[PDB]
Amino acid sequence: VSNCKFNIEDYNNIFKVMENIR
Amino acid sequence: LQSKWICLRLNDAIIKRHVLVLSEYADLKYLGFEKYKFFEYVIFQFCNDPQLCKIIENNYNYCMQIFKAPADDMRDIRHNIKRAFKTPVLGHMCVLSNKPPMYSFLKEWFLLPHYKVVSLKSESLTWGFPHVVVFDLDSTLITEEEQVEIRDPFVYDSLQELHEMGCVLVLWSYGSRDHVAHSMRDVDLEGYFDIIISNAIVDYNLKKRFIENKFVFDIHNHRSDNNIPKSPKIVIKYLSDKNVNFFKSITLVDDLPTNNYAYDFYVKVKRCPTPVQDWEHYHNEIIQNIMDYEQYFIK
Amino acid sequence: LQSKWICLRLNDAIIKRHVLVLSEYADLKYLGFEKYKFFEYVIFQFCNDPQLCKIIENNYNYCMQIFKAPADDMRDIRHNIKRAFKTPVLGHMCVLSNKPPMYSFLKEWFLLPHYKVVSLKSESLTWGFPHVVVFDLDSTLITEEEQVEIRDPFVYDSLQELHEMGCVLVLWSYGSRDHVAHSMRDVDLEGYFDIIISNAIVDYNLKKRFIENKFVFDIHNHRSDNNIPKSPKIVIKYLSDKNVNFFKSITLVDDLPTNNYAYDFYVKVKRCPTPVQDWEHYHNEIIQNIMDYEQYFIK
Amino acid sequence: VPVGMAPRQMRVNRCIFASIVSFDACITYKSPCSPDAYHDDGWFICNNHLIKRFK
Amino acid sequence: IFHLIYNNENAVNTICDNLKYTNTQRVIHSVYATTKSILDTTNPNTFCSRVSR
Amino acid sequence: RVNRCIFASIVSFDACITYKSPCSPDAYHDDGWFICNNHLIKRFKMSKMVLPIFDEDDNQFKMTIARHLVGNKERGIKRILIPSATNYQDVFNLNSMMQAEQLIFHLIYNNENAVNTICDNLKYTEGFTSNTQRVIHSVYATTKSILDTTNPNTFELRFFDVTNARALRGGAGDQLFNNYSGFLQNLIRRAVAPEYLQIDTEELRFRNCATCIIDETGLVASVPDGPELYNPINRLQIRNVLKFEGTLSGYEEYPTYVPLFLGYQIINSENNFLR
Amino acid sequence: VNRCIFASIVSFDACITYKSPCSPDAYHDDGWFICNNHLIKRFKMSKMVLPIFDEDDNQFKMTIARHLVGNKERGIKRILIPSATNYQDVFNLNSMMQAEQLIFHLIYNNENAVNTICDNLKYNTQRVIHSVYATTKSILDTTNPNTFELRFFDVTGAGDQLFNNYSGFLQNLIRRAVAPEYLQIDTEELRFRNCATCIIDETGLVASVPDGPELYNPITLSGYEEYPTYVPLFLGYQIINSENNFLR
Amino acid sequence: YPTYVPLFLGYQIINSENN
Amino acid sequence: SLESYETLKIKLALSKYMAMLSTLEMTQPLLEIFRNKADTRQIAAVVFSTLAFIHNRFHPLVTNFTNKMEFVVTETNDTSIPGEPILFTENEGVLLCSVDRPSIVKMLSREFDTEALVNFENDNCNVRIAKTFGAFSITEVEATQYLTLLLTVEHAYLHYYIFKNYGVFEYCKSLTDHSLFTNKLRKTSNLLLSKFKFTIEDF
Ligand SMILES: [Zn+2]
Ligand SMILES: [Zn+2]
C-alpha cells in the first residue's frame, strides 16, 4: 500500500533466534 | 601528575553516552552547527582561566564540572566523568581529527575521528549495555602444559553466567593464531568467545576467528612488553567491529599483571601448568569486580 | 544403607502394574496431562519434608505410603511396594528419561524411557502373569564333563511343569553361543527354553536363538565377575522383546551364587561334572520358592 | 519446585471441643481430640473430651 | 463453650465483650460460630436439624 | 472465592429438577453486598450502582447505590421493593419459587414457622433422609451464617425516614428498618443513598427530593408526592434481512435512571474516613 | 542489655499475645526507664532532648518529651499521665496483658489487684509472674529516691504535692518529660519558655495550657531550615543547688 | 451513577410526536 | 515429552496473559474491541497492560513500570508504518504510543489454518479405545489471535526498551534495522519471540 521497499533479511532478523552451544 | 580539567554534558543531545576530546574549549567552532549535538560529553584539559570558566557557565547548553586526574590514563578520567554525571556506560570515544588533542592521558586507550559518529551502527549483540572481559588464554583458562586443558572445567559455567547476565567475551593470548585456535578446538570452548586475539583465519575448520593484527604502532614512548601490555584500543576497536560501541566496564583477566594496560578492572590468576580447581574462585573475583562497578553506579 | 522413600499408587490409572522412577515428587510436571495416567505407581526417594508429605496427601489422585530400603537393590524396593499395595506382579519399569533419577538402588536392574509405555505390546506368551526363571546351563542343567549330559533327566519333567503352571524359561550360560547351542542340541532341550543367552545366530540349524549381546556397559562401579554377575536388566529386556512386559517373580538358578545380581529368588546347584539324581531336589527348591512368593501374595 | 492444584475437601471434626483454641495468635495450642471425632455419627463430642469432662 | 452448652447467655455475652474490647474478634467468631452451629444442629426441639425421629 | 450469592445456595433437591443458578459473578466481590447483582435484580427489582462523592486526587469516596427497576405505572405490590415481614409472603410468589428459596426468604424475614412447615413438608420426599435433609442442612447453615454475618449484634447515624418534608408527623420508616433483619438492614444501607451527607458540620445534598419511600408495607419505589418518575428500560429470520445498504449523535447521554436516593447520613468529628 | 518498662512481660500464659514491642532506644541507658514504643503507646509522648548554650560550654541535652496530643482531644484523651485514681480508667486493662496490668497496679499502688491477678493466673505461670514482679520492682526501686533540685512544677505546693504522690518511676517519668519554663543554674535564673505546655492536676498530667484553645499538634522554601511544629512538654521552676558545671 | 446536575424545571406539553 | 513440558510452560504464559485480560475484564473479545474504534480507552488499556506484563516477564526482579503514557490510536495509512503497528515517539518530553488499529484488526480477522494443517499429536488409538471402553472456553482461533497480539506487543515492547535504554536515536535506528535482536536472549527467555523462528525465502 505504501509502495515502500521491503527488507526481507531485516524481517528475518526480527524473527531470528541464535542457538547457543549448550 | 594530578592534572585539572573540565568536562561538559550537553543539556540536549542527539547521540548519547559519547565523549569528545578537545585540546581546548574553543574547539567547538570546529563543530559549528549540527555536530555538537552528536557529542553530549566534552572533555578537555583546563588552563586555569576564570574567564574561560565564566564563558563555559554562560554556555547554558552545557553542564560543566571540573575534576583532576593523573595525566597517563583514561581510567581515572572516565571514572570521574561517569561519577560526575552518574553514567555507568560509555559510548565510542571520539576525537577532533582536524585538531588531535595530544593528551598523554590517552596513550593507546581508544579514540575515533569525531565525524564518524553518525556512521556508527547502534545495533549490537547484547541488549542493554553489557560489560566486557578479556582473557589471556595461556595458563589463564587452560593449563600451560603442552597438552593444554581447562585448569578448572567450571570455566564453561562461568562463561555461560557471563553470557546470561550479558557481557562480551574476548580472548587475547600472545600466541600464534593457529596455536590459540587449536587450543580452543581441543578444549571445546570455541563458540563461547565473541572476540579472539593472538582476513582473520582460514584453515577449512574456521571461517573468521582471529582478526588480522593489521594495526601496528610499536609503543607510545613506554618500554614494556615487546608486543604490548595489551591494547584497550584494539579490543574496543574489535568491539565496534562486532557492533559493540557501548560498554559498562572492561576487565582484563590474565596470568600476568604486567600487561594491565588500562582496564576498568583487572584479575590475576596463577601460571599453573596443571589442572586445579581455582577458576571458580577467579570467577568469584570477576563477578565481585562487576558487582563493585554496579555498586559504584547503583544509584 | 537404609533409605527412606515414598511410593504412590494412582487411584485411577489407564496402565496398570507399572512403576515410574522420579528424582523427586515435583517431577510430575514433566508428565503434565495424559501421561501420569500411564504410571499407576510412582517411586521416589524421600527428602524428609513434612510439607512435601502434606502436599502429597493433598494430592487425592494418589494413595501414598513410605518405606525404607537399602540403597543398592530393586529387590527390597519392589517387595516393599508390592506388599504395600498387595500387587504380586510388576509391569515394565519406567524412568523419566528427561530427568533420569540417579538412584543407586537400580544399578543395572531394569528401566525404560517413560514415554515408551504406550508403545508396549500388552499381548504376551503365557496367560496371566507368569513367573520367570533363568538357568546357567554350564553344570547347572548339564554335566560339566566334556561330553555334557543332563545331570538328572528329571530336568525335562521340571521344565514341563514350569510351562504347565506358566513360567517363562530363560537360559544364560557364560559360554560361546555355539557351545550353548550345541549343548542344547545334544541334550535335546532346545524348544524348552523361551530365551537363550550366552542377528541372534545362523548356522543353518537354528534361525534365531541367541540374541546378540549388543548391550555393553562394562560395570556400574562394582568389581565383580568380569562379564557380569548376570543382568536382570538384560533378561527383562529380552522378556519385553518376547512381549513379556509383566512377571510375578524372577528366580536365578545356577551353579554359582557369586552372580546373583538381583533376583527375587536364587537357587544354587552343585558344579557336578557327572550325572547324578539331584535336579529333582533342585526343582523342589525352585517350586518351594515359587510357593513362598505365592504365600507372600496369597491374600 | 512448589506444587499445588486447587483447594481440597477433607474430613470434619465433629466434637464441639475441637473448636477449642488458645485465644493467642502468638502462642499456638492444639486441643487433644480422639480421631473418632471424624466419624459421621451422632456423637458430637470426641471420646477424649467425653472422658475428660463427663467421665 | 460450656456456657453455650448450658445457655448462660449472660456469661456468653460478658465473655464476648471482654474478648472484643482488647484477632480476638476473629477467635470469637470461630469459636462461637462452631459451637452455635453444633447446638442448632442438635436442637432436637426444632426442624431442619435431622435429630427428632 | 467466597460466593456470597445468597439465593444461589439453592439445590434442586428434587431429582427431576435441575437448578441452573445463572446469577451474577459479582458475588465473589468482598463488598458490603451479601446478594449479588442478578439475585438483586430478580428478587428486588434493583440494579447495583456506585455513586462517587469525592474523586479529586486520591479521596475516592464511592457510596454504593441501587436503581429502580419499576416503571411509572406499577403500584402497590408491583411497586414494593423490599416488603415487610408482614407482607413479603404476599409480595413474593413463594409458591412459584423453589422451596429452598422459600426457606431462604423465611429465614431472612425470621418466619421460623414457615421454615418448620417447609422442612416438615420435605420430610415426605422420597429420598428425604438420603439427601433432602442434607440439602436442608446445607441451605439452612449457609443462610444462617450469612444472616449472622449481616447482623451487627452477633459475636451509624443513617436515618431513612428523616428526609420527608410535607409529611404530617411520625417518620417510623426507621422504626420498620430497625424491625428488619440484619441482612435486610444492611441491604437497605448498601442500596439506598441518603439524600444528605453531613460530615463534621459539612452538609452535601445529592438530590433536591428523595426518590424512595419507606412505610409499613416496606420499601417502595414510589415518590413522596405526585406521579411516579419515568423509568424506562440469533435465529436468522426473514425480517432480520436488512434493506439496501443505505439526532444528537455527538453528545453524551444522561441516564434515565431512578437511583435509590433517600435519607440523611450524619458523621461526627471523624474526618474523610478512608480505610 | 536494655531497659524498658513493660518489656518484662514474659509469656506467663497461653492466652492472648506477646511479641516484645520495645523500641531499640531501650538499649540507650538514658535517664529514662521506658523506651520510645512504650512511652508513645502508653502516655502519648515521644522522647527528646534539648541543648542549652556554649557561653560556659555546657550545651547539655536537656531531657524532654514531645506532646502527641492534638488540640481536639478532651478529658481522658488529653490526659498524658493518669493518677492512681484514673489510670485504671484511662488504660484498657482488658486489652493489655495481665503482666502489664500487674505493672500498672504495682506502679500505682494497687497490690490488691496485683494479688488478685496472681491468684487468678495461678490456675509455670506463677514463677513467670514472679519474674515479672522482680523486674518491675527492681525498676521501681531504682527510680525510687528512697534508697542508699527544687524542680517546682507549681512555682514558675499543690502541683509538687501531686508529683510527689506519684511513684518513684512515675515521678522520674514526669521529671524527665516535663521541662520547667524556668531553670536556675546556681544563682542565675534563666527563662526558656514564656508559657506552659502541660498541666498537672488531680487526674494527673494533661496536655493542656493555662488558657485559650489547645495547642495545635497534628501527627517551596527548600533553601531554608525548618522549626519543629510539635509542642514539647513544659512546666515548673527548677533551681540548681551550689554545684559547678556538673557535666557528670 | 454520574454526579452531574441536569436542568429540570417547568412543565411541557405536546400533541403527537412531531419528531 | 520434554518439548511437551516447554509447550506447557508456553501455554502457562499464555494463560497468565489470559489472567491479565480477565483482570482488565473486557466484555468483548479483543477482535471486537479493536474493531470498535470508539473503544480507544479499552485499546490503550489493553496495550499498556500487555506492555507491563511483558516488562515484568522480561525483568522478573523488576515490578516497576511507567504508570502513565500518552496514547494515540491511528487509523490513516499515513499515520502508520508497515511492519511496526505500534510506535513510541516523543513529543518533546511527552512519550506518545501510536497504535495501528486497522492493522491489528486485519491481523486478527485473518483466517487461521487451524483445521487445514495436520501436525504430530498424541494419537494412540489404543488409549482412545481403552478410555471409550472405561467410560467459558477459548477456541484454537481465539488462542491464535491472542498469541499474535502478545507477540506484536512483544516486538513493540522490545523497541520501547531500546528507546528507553538507549534513546530515541537508537530507537529509530532499530526501527530501520532490527538486527540488534537476532541474538535476543543474551530476561528475554520469558518472551515468546525467543521461543521459535520465522524466515522468508525467495521462491
Ligand atoms: Zn475432639
Ligand atoms: Zn520497649
For residue I47, the SS3 value is helix
Closest CA to C141 of C270, C287, C231: C270
- Is D27's Cβ below 8 Å from some Cβ in G? yes
- Is I132's Cβ below 8 Å from some Cβ in C? no
Q: Which residue of I has its CA nearest to C33?
A: I8
Please tell me the distance in Å from I17's CA to the nearest CA on chain B. Answer: 24
I194 in Cβ contact with I186 (< 8 Å): no
B196 in Cβ contact with B242 (< 8 Å): no
What is the C-alpha R_g of chain B?
20
How far apart are the C-alpha atoms of G126 and C124, rounded to whole Å?
A: 77
The rounded Å distance from CA D17 to ligand 1 centre is 6
Concatenated DSSP letters of D2-52 = ----S---------GGGG---S-SSS-------GGGGS-SS--S-HHHIII
Strands (E), G35-148: 45-50, 62-67, 79-82
| Residue B97 CA neighbour count, 13 Å, CB half | 9
What method was applied to determine this entry?
cryo-EM
Contacts of C14 in chain I (CB under 8 A): 127, 130-131, 134
- Is I86's Cβ below 8 Å from some Cβ in A? no
Q: Which residue of D has its CA nearest to E16?
A: D23
How far apart are the C-alpha atoms of G167 and G115, rounded to whole Å?
A: 19
Closest CA to I146 of I16, I3, I44, I4: I16
Cα angle, residue C196 at apex, residues C170 and C142 outer, rounded to 5°: 80
How far apart are the C-alpha atoms of C251 and C131, rounded to whole Å?
A: 8
Which residue type occupies C35? Answer: K
Q: Among D19, D40, D45, which would you mutate to test the E interface (most chain E Cβ atoms within 10 Å of its Cβ)?
A: D19
**Which residue matches cell numbers 517413560?**
C114
Closest CA to C169 of C178, C179, C161, C180: C161
C38 in Cβ contact with C117 (< 8 Å): yes
**Which residue matches cell numbers 439496501?**
F244
Contact at CB, I178 and A10, closer than 8 angstroms: yes
Maximum separation of any 2 CA atoms in chain F, in Å: 69
How far apart are the C-alpha atoms of C137 and C182, rounded to whole Å?
A: 12
The rounded Å distance from CA B81 to ligand 1 centre is 73
For residue B93, the SS3 value is strand
How far apart are the C-alpha atoms of B218 and G225, rounded to whole Å?
A: 61
- Is I2's Cβ below 8 Å from some Cβ in C? yes
B106 in Cβ contact with B261 (< 8 Å): no
**Which residue matches cell numbers 435431622?**
E50
Contact at CB, B16 and I166, closer than 8 angstroms: yes
Closest CB to F155: pick one of E29, E40, E46: E29
Which residue type occupies C254? Answer: D
Q: Which residue of D has its CA nearest to C27?
A: D1
For residue I109, the SS3 value is helix
Could you tell me the end-to-end alpha-carbon distance of chain C, in angstroms, rounded to an integer? Answer: 30
CA distances from G229 to G40, G68, G213, G215, G236 (A): 18, 11, 16, 10, 22
Q: Which residue of A has its CA nearest to I78?
A: A2
Which residue type occupies C63? Answer: C
How far apart are the C-alpha atoms of C256 and C228, rounded to whole Å?
A: 12
How far apart are the C-alpha atoms of F16 and F13, rounded to whole Å?
A: 9
- Is I184's Cβ below 8 Å from some Cβ in A? yes
Contact at CB, D23 and G11, closer than 8 angstroms: no
The rounded Å distance from CA G139 to ligand 2 centre is 13
Number of C-beta neighbours around residue F48 at 10 A: 21
Concatenated DSSP letters of F102-162 = HHHHHHHTT-HHHHHHHHHHHTTSTTIIIIIHHHHHHHHHHHHHHHHHH-TT----EESST
3-state secondary structure string across B144-189 = CCCCCCECCCHHHHHHHHHHHHCEEEEEECCCCHHHHHHHHHHHCC
**Which residue matches cell numbers 446536575?**
H5
Please tell me the distance in Å from I129's CA to the nearest CA on chain A. Answer: 41
Residue I14: exposed, middle, or buried by beta-carbon count in 10 A (0-12, 13-18, 19+)? Answer: middle
Sorted by sequence, the CB contacts under 8 Å of residue B96 that are 6+ apart come out as: B20, B21, B22, B23, B27, B30, B114
Which residues are B70's β-sheet partners? B2
Contact at CB, F52 and H6, closer than 8 angstroms: no
Neighbours of chain A (3+ CB pairs under 8 A): B, I
Contact at CB, C98 and I122, closer than 8 angstroms: no
- Is F65's Cβ below 8 Å from some Cβ in H? yes
Which residue type occupies I148? Answer: T
- Helix (H) / strand (E) containing F213: strand F213-215
Contact at CB, I1 and C14, closer than 8 angstroms: no
Sorted by sequence, the CB contacts under 8 Å of residue F221 that are 6+ apart come out as: F45, F68, F70, F74, F79, F81, F211, F212, F213, F228, F231, F258
The rounded Å distance from CA G248 to ligand 2 centre is 26
How far apart are the C-alpha atoms of C73 and C179, rounded to whole Å?
A: 32
Query: What ligand has the least distance to the C-alpha of G23?
Result: 2
Contacts of D23 in chain G (CB under 8 A): 15-16
The rounded Å distance from CA D38 to ligand 1 centre is 9
Please tell me the distance in Å from E19's CA to the nearest CA on chain F. Answer: 10
Beta carbon pairs, A and I, within 8 Å: 46
Which residue type occupies B252? Answer: L
Closest CA to I53 of I149, I176, I181: I149
Please tell me the distance in Å from C31's CA to the nearest CA on chain D. Answer: 13
List the grid coordinates of F83. 416488603
Backbone CA torsion sign across F140, F146, F148, F151: negative
CA dihedral F175, F177, F179, F180 (to 10 degrees): 170
Closest CA to B252 of B81, B131, B145, B161: B131
b or e along I49-82 (b: 16 or more beta carbons within 10 Å of the residue's beta carbon)?
bbbbbbbbbbeeeeeeeeeebebebbeeeeebee
The rounded Å distance from CA G77 to ligand 2 centre is 22
Q: Which residue of E has its CA nearest to D43?
A: E42
Which residues are C4's β-sheet partners? C68
Closest CA to F209 of F166, F242, F256: F166
- Is F136's Cβ below 8 Å from some Cβ in E? yes
Contacts of C58 in chain D (CB under 8 A): 5, 8
- Note residues around ion ligand 2 (Cβ under 5 angstroms): G 4, 7, 22, 26, 35, 37-38
- Is D24's Cβ below 8 Å from some Cβ in G? yes
List the grid coordinates of F89. 409472603
How far apart are the C-alpha atoms of G120 and I12, rounded to whole Å?
A: 59
Sorted by sequence, the CB contacts under 8 Å of residue F199 that are 6+ apart come out as: F267, F270, F271, F272
**Which residue matches cell numbers 557501548?**
B246
